[PDB]
Amino acid sequence: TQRYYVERPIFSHPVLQERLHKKDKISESIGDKLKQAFTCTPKKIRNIIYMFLPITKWLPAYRFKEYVLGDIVSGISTGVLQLPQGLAFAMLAAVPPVFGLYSSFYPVIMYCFFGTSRHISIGPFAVISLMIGGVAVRLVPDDIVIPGGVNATNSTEARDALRVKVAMSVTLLTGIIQFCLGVCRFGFVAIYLTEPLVRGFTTAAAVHVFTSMLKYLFGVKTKRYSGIFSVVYSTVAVLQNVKNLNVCSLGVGLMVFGLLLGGKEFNERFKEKLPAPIPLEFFAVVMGTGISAGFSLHESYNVDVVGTLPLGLLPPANPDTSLFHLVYVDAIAIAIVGFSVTISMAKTLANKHGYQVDGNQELIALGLCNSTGSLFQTFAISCSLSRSLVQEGTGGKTQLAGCLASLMILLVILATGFLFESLPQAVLSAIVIVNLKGMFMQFSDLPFFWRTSKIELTIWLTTFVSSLFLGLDYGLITAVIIALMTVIYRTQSPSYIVLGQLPDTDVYIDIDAYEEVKEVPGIKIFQINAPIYYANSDLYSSALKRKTGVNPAFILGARRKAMKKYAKYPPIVTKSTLPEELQRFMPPGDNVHTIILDFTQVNFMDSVGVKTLAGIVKEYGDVGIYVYLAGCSAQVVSDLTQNQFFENPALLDLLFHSIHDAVLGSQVREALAEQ
Amino acid sequence: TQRYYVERPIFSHPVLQERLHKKDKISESIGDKLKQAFTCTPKKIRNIIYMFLPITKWLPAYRFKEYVLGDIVSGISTGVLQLPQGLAFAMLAAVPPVFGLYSSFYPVIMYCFFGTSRHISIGPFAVISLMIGGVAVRLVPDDIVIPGGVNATNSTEARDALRVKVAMSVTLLTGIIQFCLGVCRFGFVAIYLTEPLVRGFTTAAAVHVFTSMLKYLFGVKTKRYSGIFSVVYSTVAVLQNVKNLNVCSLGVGLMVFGLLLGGKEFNERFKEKLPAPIPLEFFAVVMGTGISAGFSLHESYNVDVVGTLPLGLLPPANPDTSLFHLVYVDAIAIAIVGFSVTISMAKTLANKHGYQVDGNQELIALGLCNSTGSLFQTFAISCSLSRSLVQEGTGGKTQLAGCLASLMILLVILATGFLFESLPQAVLSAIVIVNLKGMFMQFSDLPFFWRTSKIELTIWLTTFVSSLFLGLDYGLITAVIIALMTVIYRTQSPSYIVLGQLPDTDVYIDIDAYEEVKEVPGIKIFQINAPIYYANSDLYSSALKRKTGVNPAFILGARRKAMKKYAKYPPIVTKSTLPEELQRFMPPGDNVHTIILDFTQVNFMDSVGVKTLAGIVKEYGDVGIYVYLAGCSAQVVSDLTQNQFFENPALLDLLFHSIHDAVLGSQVREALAEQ
């Protein structure tokens, strides 16, 4: 009507090509673009400093008026949750518990200096601690009888110190690997961690942490498992040793568990203006240690206890390097899983607040944290998932909440430690299990991805199962590979639709979707929303033949049967005119004379796709049906040209700019044929 | 001009949707389509019989007049090449050589009954024989001293028989696995074997066969290697034991090698009308055995010899099944690699002649061949690559060439065998090495895929290297995974191009490609030829901001700096009109008022892509720039709707049917704004 007036000639490929002339587009010194900048410009230097060491821009652009309160409250809460988590993951690392406080202190300040994620908290992260403990057990097994010299009982201090040394070596190697990956721009790999992949992976990690804390909650001594089917073995071992437990350890653990669930529900449900997310975990830990000490619980009823915490800050003893030959593989595994968890949580919390986390810079910061921690008697670190959620939800505006947690841990390690000596391990297990609630709430993503899109649900469930039953490392690798497989599947099951023309317009849409579209007579239009490549070409050809209802093989068979019933410079022609007897013995099907293949949606093709297109064109030409490509893009035209599809026959004339151009060209030649 | 006259109203999404009404499209009993056919129709029964047991259609549709000559000549040549190849692969399987003739006899007739590939020959295929020999060595090592009873020298017959039993068990398991995969429609996986993948894999297999035949060519006894870096270990072992060789074995081997190369060049170069591809290999083997016997070569100069061939056809002794517990994994590996090689060669020879090979039916036929062979004292089988090329090139029109080879092997095993007793292993090694020439000629694909397309070259080289250095099994798996990774890369590096309008038409093409396209004033058009999904969204957004030259963040910064210099039911609005002071202090850039995102090429999106589009629209709306989606397909519109992108705001009005519709709608609203 009033608008959209075109009045333009028929643009086949040769017409549009002769209409317009190419440009130069060849810029000089291309491919060596970054060689010739290398400048000492102040802006570039400040940008590099901002990118490597972001605290140069964190501090000056600080907003006191509200961030002071936000970070104060969030840091208080996150350090409160940090102390018991650090202790529990330390005792789970087969390392004396104070090294958990060291790991909760040093890497936090190092990340503050070098990290970019606003809402993140850095600590032991029990699965990393599990791998560290498995390595320590492997290198320093329990049965080792060392000639100490005093000829006394087999004190565990020597074995514990050897395990600590193993932890130092492996964590230093992970730090070095992480830094080396970070400088070499490996953080780009963090783009393959989808949202459902991250959700499933973190939920599997939460299930791992739960099944790990089970054995301390029950007060049961069981053999430590690590590797593949680790969670299954841990759970079955706990259930096999469900007998001979410690009834009082369960009593205190479940008591603090129930009171802590009640407190969390009280604190979340009854949210008001002035009330803040009270530090429940500190109350839990102080009541637990008070009950344990007042009732002599460790010596009366034989409950497992944290034990003695050697006070003071130890000097930076340089670690050994001769255990790398034995720990390189598990150092690689620890570094990979730590980076994956850190970037996954930093990204899923950056999505909520709209800021960009550089995966490479996260990797560099995490590696430097791990290395300096190894220098300062610290095992490997990562992002604590539950503490990250707690710091985010409480309103941590900057990294200063992490700093506040670090200084509270510093207070615990310098002044106190007399106090938390008599603390049941059940209290720590209950605290960790309760704080896994934020991770466990991610199971609501199953109905969501069921309604929204089942490919994302498949990614979620596959990541969850693979990451739960295998380790987080192998589970993560297989989950990423399968998430990438989903794209191949999505290009392997396209939507082949036959198009029909909206009357007296140029709009071509699905014939069997809107009933106001009547396909133009004697023309069939095919349309695939996928690239035509090796994993897709045969399906595309078969679908064309099936859906258009025009199979050249059946047509040739019909010609042969009709003939049977009748018994009563280059030499190139791309179109064999039909030498039929001009009879009706063939089935009275449609009299289609051309087929238009819509390549607007076809992103690319490779050699197999071009071969199958040559086959399609040749077959339909042999039967007597023209084939037109419509809307071929420059990428697709180049992919057709590189392969020997245009040996300059009248094949460059089969291409048209759009579907309507192809329809009009076919109608024009059909009218010309009647002349 | 004369044609292409549209004269149609502006079709935004709501206008086109209200113009036309949806159909039903809901067919009854959908999703259970194959439940309600289950017919005894004669056509369906004959189709099923043709599909499972194709010899029912091979024989009746046979064309004597030319296929008789073709199959006669091709069968003669292929059986001639079959005999020495069978013997060599048998002695390489750590199995006495006659079982090579059994393997060359029974599975060939079984495949004739059940196989679909016209141009294929079935035999031992030295790498499969290598895996079989490795399994036999593992289960029956050389050092085993069995109490035979005669208390004589440690005769190898008992050890050889135990190795044969192991071969029986493993090949029966491979046959069962292959059949079970074939019935369960596993042959669809053969669609992921690209052309370059197949070429690289078969060239790596040829290199494997060459390095395997080296040690028999040199007459050197070396430890057998199998597994990962197998070829490297075999070659380094041969070169380490390059000393203490057998000079006469090398003499005869290189003599027949040179004469055979000369004969092959004579036979191929001097091709004429009446001359046929003479059976060179039979002359080679007969001269070799004549020289070995006449000069007493095995006992005079100590050359390795084929040995005695126990005459006659052995009865179908049923194999044991208690070795499955030990050989299941290598049976799976053998079945996978055998199917991969068979389908790869059958497909690459079906491409030359234009006929379809059902991967599932190939798998079923190969499994039945392996199983019945295990019943008849046969080790595992596959498609011989060199013999497949020889049968194809000589002009094998049907499977009867395979039958002729099988009957010639039957003649060798029933009548002769007295003769080939004194045959040097060097002659067989030279024959195999010479016949690897067809596979080695595939190295010409490197310049071809260098000029044509470098993704295919990357697939070729990666498949070759991975399949050569790892085994064919792990190499094949990694090659397939990387070939699928290339599609992810191809969607991760699209061609972002800014479009410009061809004057007074509706054709929009690249601005910096043709210099006759002038972009419409105050509009920027962006265009990606890729899906917008998780691995692609951030790159797409950054590329839009960079290439269009319109970054909302820099624009907001410019507004803030201008303000600084000045110091001298639902509540939804998708477009924040600019509250500027109406001043020029901002940089004098373009005054773009809308950005049109071309989604014609966008095949699909997932949750991450829809999130980044919501972000893009929100950002540009906040700055004061409209964003229009142009050409969204039904798949993309559904992907936008499932995710909460249309919460029925004026967002369903941002979609337009085509680029020109979006341009005209933006110009219309801009004109209306001036009112």
Domain ranges of chain B: 62-146+153-489, 497-673
Query: By 3-state DSSP, what share of chain B in percent is helix, strand and coil, each rounded to 5?
Result: 60, 5, 35
Tell whether A618 is within 8 A of chain B (Cβ): no
Question: Min CA distance, B454 vs chain A (Å)?
Answer: 10
C-alpha to C-alpha distance for A402 and A78, rounded to whole angstroms: 8
DSSP labels, B591-643: ---EEEEE-SS---B-HHHHHHHHHHHHHHHHHT-EEEEES--HHHHHHHHHT
C-alpha to C-alpha distance for A546 and B191, rounded to whole angstroms: 19
Tell me how far CA of residue A247 lies from CA of A242, B53, B116, in angstroms: 11, 69, 70
| Binding region of B for salicylate | 386
- Chain B residues within an 8 Å CB radius of A488: 484, 487
Tell whether A556 is within 8 A of chain B (Cβ): no
B122 DSSP β-pair partners: B383
Tell whether A511 is within 8 A of chain B (Cβ): no
- Chain A residues within an 8 Å CB radius of B600: 600-601, 631
Strand, helix or coil for residue A628: strand
Tell whether B638 is within 8 A of chain A (Cβ): no
C-alpha to C-alpha distance for A431 and A419, rounded to whole angstroms: 18
Long-range contacts, B260-268 (Cβ 8 Å, 24+): B260/B284, B260/B430, B260/B431, B260/B434, B261/B434, B264/B434, B264/B437
A123 DSSP β-pair partners: A382
Between residues 401 and 440 of chain B, which touch chain A (CB distance below 8 Å)? none
Residue A423, H or E segment: none
- Identify the CA nearest to B139 among candidates B303, B329, B1: B329
Q: In residues, how long is chain B?
A: 675
- CB–CB contacts below 8 A, A to B: 215
Instruction: Answer yes or no: are the C-beta atoms of A310 and A353 closer than 8 Å.
Output: no
Most A CBs within 10 Å, among B529, B533, B639, B670, to test the A interface:
B529
- Identify the CA nearest to B282 among candidates B98, B107, B409: B409
Whether residues A1 and B9 touch (CB distance < 8 A) is answered with: yes
Whether residues A664 and B506 touch (CB distance < 8 A) is answered with: no
Tell whether A534 is within 8 A of chain B (Cβ): yes
Task: Show the tokens assigned to B525.
Answer: 């058009």
Q: In residues, how long is chain A?
A: 675
Which CATH number does the domain B497-673 belong to among 3.40.50.1820, 3.10.20.30, 3.30.750.24, 3.40.50.10800?
3.30.750.24
Tell whether B274 is within 8 A of chain A (Cβ): no
- Chain B residues within an 8 Å CB radius of A639: 453
C-alpha to C-alpha distance for A159 and A189, rounded to whole angstroms: 39
Tell whether B397 is within 8 A of chain A (Cβ): no
CB atoms within 10 A of CB B661: 27
Quote the Cα angle for A177-A182-A186, to 5°.
Answer: 100
Strand, helix or coil for residue A498: strand
C-alpha to C-alpha distance for A69 and A82, rounded to whole angstroms: 19
A415: exposed, middle or buried (Cβ count in 10 Å: 0-12, 13-18, 19+): exposed
The alpha carbon dihedral of A385, A387, A393, A397 has a sign of: negative
The resolution in angstroms reads 3.3
C-alpha to C-alpha distance for A359 and A347, rounded to whole angstroms: 9
C-alpha to C-alpha distance for A322 and A477, rounded to whole angstroms: 29
Task: Show the tokens assigned to A166.
Answer: 């193993």
B596 DSSP β-pair partners: B525, B628
Strand, helix or coil for residue A662: helix
Question: Min CA distance, B631 vs chain A (Å)?
Answer: 10
Task: Show the tokens assigned to B84.
Answer: 């020495």
Question: Min CA distance, B514 vs chain A (Å)?
Answer: 4
- Chain B residues within an 8 Å CB radius of A604: 490, 529
Most A CBs within 10 Å, among B197, B448, B604, B640, to test the A interface:
B604
C-alpha to C-alpha distance for B190 and A534, rounded to whole angstroms: 11
The alpha carbon dihedral of A514, A550, A618, B385 has a sign of: positive
Instruction: Answer yes or no: are the C-beta atoms of B366 and B178 closer than 8 Å.
Output: yes
Instruction: Answer yes or no: are the C-beta atoms of B365 and B114 closer than 8 Å.
Output: yes
C-alpha to C-alpha distance for B654 and B670, rounded to whole angstroms: 14
What residue of A is the nearest CA neighbor of B534? A194
- A149 Rama sector, left if φ>0, alpha if ψ -120 to 50, beta otherwise: left
Between residues 65 and 104 of chain A, which touch chain B (CB distance below 8 Å)? none
Instruction: Answer yes or no: are the C-beta atoms of A213 and A88 closer than 8 Å.
Output: yes
Tell me how far CA of residue B326 lies from CA of B139, B173, B319, B330, B335, in angstroms: 9, 11, 15, 9, 16
What DSSP character marks residue A509? E
C-alpha to C-alpha distance for B245 and B253, rounded to whole angstroms: 13
Instruction: Answer yes or no: are the C-beta atoms of B622 and B655 closer than 8 Å.
Output: no
Q: Which residues contact B150 (CB under 8 A, 6 or more apart)?
A: none
Tell me how far CA of residue A222 lies from CA of A90, A132, A235, A428, A433, in angstroms: 17, 18, 10, 18, 19
Whether residues A507 and B642 touch (CB distance < 8 A) is answered with: no
Place of tokens 């890729």: B530
- Identify the CA nearest to A360 among candidates A346, A378, A380, A379: A346
Whether residues B4 and A4 touch (CB distance < 8 A) is answered with: no
Query: By 3-state DSSP, what share of chain A in percent is helix, strand and coil, each rounded to 5?
Result: 60, 5, 35
Question: Min CA distance, A614 vs chain B (Å)?
Answer: 12
Strand, helix or coil for residue B272: coil
C-alpha to C-alpha distance for B209 and B196, rounded to whole angstroms: 20
Q: Which residues contact A386 (CB under 8 A, 6 or more apart)?
A: A81, A85, A206, A432, A435, A436, A438, A439
- Identify the CA nearest to B131 among candidates B380, B374, B345, B377: B380
Tell whether A33 is within 8 A of chain B (Cβ): no
Task: Show the tokens assigned to B572.
Answer: 């939804």
C-alpha to C-alpha distance for B281 and B431, rounded to whole angstroms: 7
B307: exposed, middle or buried (Cβ count in 10 Å: 0-12, 13-18, 19+): middle
Q: Which residues contact A377 (CB under 8 A, 6 or more apart)?
A: A99, A102, A164, A168, A314, A317
- Chain B residues within an 8 Å CB radius of A542: none
Whether residues B4 and A6 touch (CB distance < 8 A) is answered with: yes
Strand, helix or coil for residue A102: helix
Tell whether A535 is within 8 A of chain B (Cβ): yes
Most A CBs within 10 Å, among B19, B480, B507, B538, to test the A interface:
B507
Strand, helix or coil for residue B123: strand
C-alpha to C-alpha distance for B656 and A386, rounded to whole angstroms: 45
Question: Min CA distance, A669 vs chain B (Å)?
Answer: 13
What DSSP character marks residue A520? P
Whether residues A535 and B633 touch (CB distance < 8 A) is answered with: no
CB atoms within 10 A of CB B420: 24
- Chain B residues within an 8 Å CB radius of A514: 20-23
What residue of A is the nearest CA neighbor of B660? A4
C-alpha to C-alpha distance for B612 and B538, rounded to whole angstroms: 7
A81: exposed, middle or buried (Cβ count in 10 Å: 0-12, 13-18, 19+): buried
Whether residues A642 and B194 touch (CB distance < 8 A) is answered with: no
C-alpha to C-alpha distance for A80 and A407, rounded to whole angstroms: 11
- Identify the CA nearest to B369 among candidates B348, B390, B338, B397: B338
Instruction: Answer yes or no: are the C-beta atoms of A106 and A403 closer than 8 Å.
Output: no
Between residues 330 and 389 of chain A, which touch chain B (CB distance below 8 Å)? 351, 354
The alpha carbon dihedral of B122, B123, B127, B128 has a sign of: positive
